[PDB]
């Protein structure tokens, strides 16, 4: 039982870390989209001419 509760706490910690990893990946994707918009804007400006 003691080992069981220890493993349960470890799994809760790992699940929380996985959720934080998903959040960080979301932030990274948003940053990449922000950079892409800045880069793609000028190409459409050139394509507008």
């Amino acid at each position: 039982e003691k080992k069981r509760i220890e493993a349960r706490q470890m799994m809760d910690g790992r699940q929380a870390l996985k959720k934080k990893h998903l959040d960080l990946l979301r932030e990274f994707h948003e940053r990449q989209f922000f950079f892409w918009y800045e880069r793609a804007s000028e190409r459409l400006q050139n394509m507008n001419l």
Binding site: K20, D23, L24, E27, F34, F35, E38
Partner: protein
């Protein structure tokens, strides 16, 4: 900003953050961003995050005034008002409870959210001057 660009001096991050913190409305913030783009300034993730913080705090102030009205009219705060007080804006961009999103160069940037008076901006400069003169 045209004169600044012509002289070549670069606008500092804290100056931009306070500039976006002083804004009143979303239209005003958008006009400021458009003017900065027109003045030939290369946008950065710090500037984008400052804009996002300004939007979040605009909505935060709106909700705060809305709940202030109900508190004044009733004489007692409501459960929704308490929940908003605790958890901020419901599903807001760059949520405050998790401070690992609004970070640039591993440093959190939450300056452009609360209104700054003529003294709050000056306090940092006075502290730096005192540190220079003392240590």
């Amino acid at each position: 900003m045209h004169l600044a660009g012509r002289n070549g001096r670069e606008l500092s991050v804290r100056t931009i953050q306070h500039l976006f913190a002083r804004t009143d409305s979303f239209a005003e913030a958008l006009a400021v961003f458009y003017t900065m783009r027109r003045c030939h300034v290369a946008m950065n993730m710090e500037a984008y995050y400052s804009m996002l913080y300004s939007l979040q705090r605009l909505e935060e102030e709106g909700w705060g005034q809305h709940f202030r009205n109900e508190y004044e009219e009733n004489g007692a705060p409501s459960e929704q008002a308490m929940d908003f007080i605790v958890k901020g804006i419901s599903n807001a961009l760059l949520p405050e409870n998790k401070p690992w999103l609004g970070r640039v160069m591993f440093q959190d940037r939450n300056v452009p959210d609360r209104r700054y008076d003529t003294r709050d901006f000056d306090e940092l400069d006075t502290a730096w001057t005192q540190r220079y003169k003392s240590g």
